[PDB]
């Protein structure tokens, strides 16, 4: 993008702030060199303790040393990471809410130029919040921890180097070995996840299309078809999740043997070295954990610098705004000052070009002159948006060609702020900023009193109005109580410009919201201080300028004439035309819902049994090997050694044995589960009335999104955590009853004291993802007041107020930089305190087992295979709890998502014993039937409304361009549910019919050219499945539609739509009568598209239509006010009342009643 410079971004701060700078950054060195010397310390005190093993009386002299040694590091670390935490993260605080002041007063420093709704100005309010947040987390948190992570690789590295010399090359040596495999796993598993996530979408679109087009499919209901095709997808997708799931088993089982096999490796060719009298025992063992831990810190360290680059590209794009000079500013020094005004105003060949973008000339030569207290106004041509000849007044665009003068007086050198109070001005945007109306009040004048409102109020017809609410007159505009806009507030912006009583005052179009009362009283308020004052009113509508006894005419852009509208009529002046127009106007039964795979689940739990003691023998052989080296006499231990050598690769031969297991049997608990849930959640949705799909946010492109991410997420919070939970609780089990039979006497104070170590062990996961927690939940409501105040920068010119909105914006900072303040030491001091246990309850322990030896009963073993053996099973455990908020916290909703799975459907389609539906010749009869939309329940549509057919008479229906009659036809089938009325169908009612029969018999051609995404075959092959292609060929014969395929290549076989050919025309329609002509159903309907089939050559559908009626009685309704073929039946039906019950043929003889309104195109108006 640009140059996105690093260390500029520290360019905001002064003296009392580097200062915290430094001391984070000495807390984080401390911090990263120590967490290593941890291991120095134990090596060295291992080998103390070693030495002198019938050396009795040395125990305690040199294991309390090393005690008050741990106790030390314990209160170092907690010191230095409080002084880090707290100072970064207030510091990054400061800073962004500094460059935030400094962006927002530089924001309206600028003139509205740069400020157009071509979503700049939406792009304001992104780039203010999402960029700011971007920046302060970036810096805020990972400098500190890209600089401790660093200072951990080089403190580890340099105390692994030199302890031996020799051991730390072979120690790192392993380490790309480990990260081959770790790097191919992740390749290989993103590919196979991102080849996955292919076939599922396939049938996707098929549900999309399905959910889409509900209104038709209930239609010639098959509502099979799709779900055979779906389930015939997701059995691929189960089949790639089988894949997926072996492949990511084998990969952790090899990566873990193989860590296993470089460990063996490492620690037989130390004792080699062991033997050879060049070194001992615990130097050799902090040399290895040193080396390793060094080596591997750069893992967490580097994915810090990912934000990083991004936080430069939040760089620019930002500040670049505070470096842009506008054009006029009130100087100091301009030395004007005038008095005595009158508001004559001079404008000189006004010739202006948009500087966005050139277009069509704005004015050309435009010097008209404006009488000091007139009523002159102007109008354009076409209205063209002229308002801005009052902005020039307001000085928003300099004017290119010519000069202005105000008064006489030119208006460039005067201060721009004494202009400022010359004007009144008035925006069509009567909502105002979320404030209190009192304060809203106050900008017409800062010292204003409570008179002075209330006569205001008085003047703009306000008083003793708004009073009538529960607030004493306490209400802010941007409440959503006080919504309403013009019912109670009633632009209360007039009032607050009675307050500022400028010289001069202007006006704009706000007559467009209605022509009422409050309107109308508002404008007798302006025109009473219309005294003193030239008023110009600029507006598209030009019904209310008869008061202007000054109008100029412009249309081309130059001023032609001025005068009276009265005068304005000879000769029509291009004006009469436009008046005239103007006046004519969560897992209870989920394993139930999981019973059918009783076997290959048990098994499951077998292997995740059997996984879970990789760690305890690991543990227990290399706190043997730790023991062994102590043997003084110079022979036996080669056997021994070579035993847990050959322990080792059997143990990581067992991880590859028995991860694939654990691994690919529960994958199909996690994918079979899925399978099943998904056809039977999609079963649920069909099955439901089809008002639920009304809703706007129920929509189409919704449901099949929402549905792809609560399937996948059902494995996750079923699946995996039950095989993670019985995993680590039969490690942590085997654990301790190890612990208990190997010893007995220490184990109490290790049980005493492991919530405290498991508890510092969370806390250092948590130290990851960084303590800044959640972010905007508290910091959004200074950007809330930023984002408003940026959209109305127009509004905000006026009345000019920026230093109280700065003034605003600077006090509302206070809450949050006192939230990070208190959060920064409520978070660091407790990380502290709980990071000094973790080595405080290291010097107990060893220092009781130490006590113990020399005067109990016990060796130097039984107090390393007891510490050992349960400080890593400790940090294990760790994970167990840290995966909390997945289960419960994350896991209840979208692992209970299943509410459409139970929801109870309005209308039940599977019907029990309702009644059958045989050969019927359908006549259906309305009686005080009562019918609403059930989206808008405000609106009455049918009210006791009666309709009966008298014998197979084809009717016939009005249209009235299709005024909410599209409502009629679908009261026939079952898509709603009349709200109180008789619908009469062969002597019943339509509810106590089985539906499923009924629909087969209905018939009902639709007015959308939309289709399925089959073949245009199977297109017509929808209707009557199973008919054979030859009644196909024939149904084409008969719709006339052979020549509208023969011409495309593939004839019938061409697919049609997306991923297809596509083809323009109603024929579409006539696509649909070849369906309707396979069902030649006893009960038909028809429709005509109202508005939408502009298409010529309607003959051919007419035609079509006519012979679809041939053999059966129908009915239509359609908009079309010709081409009517219905016999004695027009039904003339308006304002949801029957008003006409005869005949098209002889309701012409009636002059007067029905055929009055009838008559209103029906004839001309085609």
Known sequence: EQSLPFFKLFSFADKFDYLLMFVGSLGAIVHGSSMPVFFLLFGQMVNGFGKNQMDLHQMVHEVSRYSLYFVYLGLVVCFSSYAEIACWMYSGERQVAALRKKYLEAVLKQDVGFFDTDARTGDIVFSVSTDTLLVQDAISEKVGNFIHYLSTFLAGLVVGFVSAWKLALLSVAVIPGIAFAGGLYAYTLTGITSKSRESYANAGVIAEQAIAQVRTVYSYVGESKALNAYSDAIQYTLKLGYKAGMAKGLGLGCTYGIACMSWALVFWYAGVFIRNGQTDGGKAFTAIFSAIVGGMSLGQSFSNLGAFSKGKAAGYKLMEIINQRPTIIQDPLDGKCLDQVHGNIEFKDVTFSYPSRPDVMIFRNFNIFFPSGKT???????????????????????????????????????????????????????????????????????????????????????????????????????????????????????????????????????????????????????????????????????????????????????????????????????????????????????????????????????????????????????????????????????????????????????????????????????????????????????????????????????????????????????????????????????????????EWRVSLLILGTFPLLVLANFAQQLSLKGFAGDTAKAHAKTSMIAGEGVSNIRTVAAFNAQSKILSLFCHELRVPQKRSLYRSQTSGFLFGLSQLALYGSEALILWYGAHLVSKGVSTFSKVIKVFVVLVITANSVAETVSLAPEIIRGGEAVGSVFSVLDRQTRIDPDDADADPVETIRGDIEFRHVDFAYPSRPDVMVFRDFNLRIRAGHSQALVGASGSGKSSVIAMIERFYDPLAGKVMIDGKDIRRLNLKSLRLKIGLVQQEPALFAATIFDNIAYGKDGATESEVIDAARAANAHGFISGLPEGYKTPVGERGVQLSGGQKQRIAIARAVLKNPTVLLLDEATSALDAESECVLQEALERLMRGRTTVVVAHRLSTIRGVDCIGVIQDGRIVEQGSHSELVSRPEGAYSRLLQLQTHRI
């Open 376 to 742: 002159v106004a102007v109008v354009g041509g076409s209205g063209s948006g002229k308002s801005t000849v009052v902005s020039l007044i307001e000085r928003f665009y300099d004017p290119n060609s010519g000069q202005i003068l105000l008064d006489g007086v030119e208006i460039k050198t005067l201060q721009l702020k004494f202009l400022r109070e010359q004007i009144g001005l008035v925006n069509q945007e009567p909502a105002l900023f979320a404030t209190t109306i009192l304060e809203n009040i106050l900008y017409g004048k800062p010292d204003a009193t409570m008179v002075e409102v209330e006569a205001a109020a008085s003047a703009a017809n306000a008083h003793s109005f708004i009073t009538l609410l529960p607030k004493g007159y306490d209400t802010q505009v941007g409440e959503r109580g006080v919504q309403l806009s013009g019912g109670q507030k009633q632009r209360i912006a007039i009032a607050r410009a009675m307050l500022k009583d400028p010289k001069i005052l202007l006006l704009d179009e706000a007559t467009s919201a209605l022509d009422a009362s409050s309107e109308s009283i508002v404008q007798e308020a302006l025109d009473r201080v219309m005294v003193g004052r030239t008023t110009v009113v600029v507006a598209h509508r030009l019904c209310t300028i008869r008061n202007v006894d000054s109008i100029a005419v412009i249309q081309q852009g130059q001023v032609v004439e001025t005068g009276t509208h009265e005068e304005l009529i000879a000769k029509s002046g291009a004006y009469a035309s436009l008046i005239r127009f103007q006046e004519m106007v969560y897992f209870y039964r989920l394993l139930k819902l999981n019973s059918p795979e009783w076997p290959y689940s048990i098994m499951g739990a077998v292997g995740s049994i059997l996984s879970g003691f990789i760690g305890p023998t690991f543990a227990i052989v290399m706190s043997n090997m730790i023991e062994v080296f102590y043997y003084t006499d110079y022979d036996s231990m080669e056997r021994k050694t070579k035993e847990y050598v050959f322990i080792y690769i059997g143990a990581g031969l067992y991880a590859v044995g028995a991860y694939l297991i654990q691994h690919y049997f529960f994958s199909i608990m996690g994918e079979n589960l899925t399978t099943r849930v998904r056809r039977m959640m999609l079963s649920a949705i069909l099955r439901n009335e089809v008002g639920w799909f009304d809703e706007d946010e129920h929509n189409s492109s919704l449901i099949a999104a929402r549905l792809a991410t609560d399937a996948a997420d059902v494995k996750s919070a079923i699946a995996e955590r039950i095989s993670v939970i019985l995993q680590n609780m039969t490690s942590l089990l085997t654990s301790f009853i190890v612990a208990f039979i190997v």
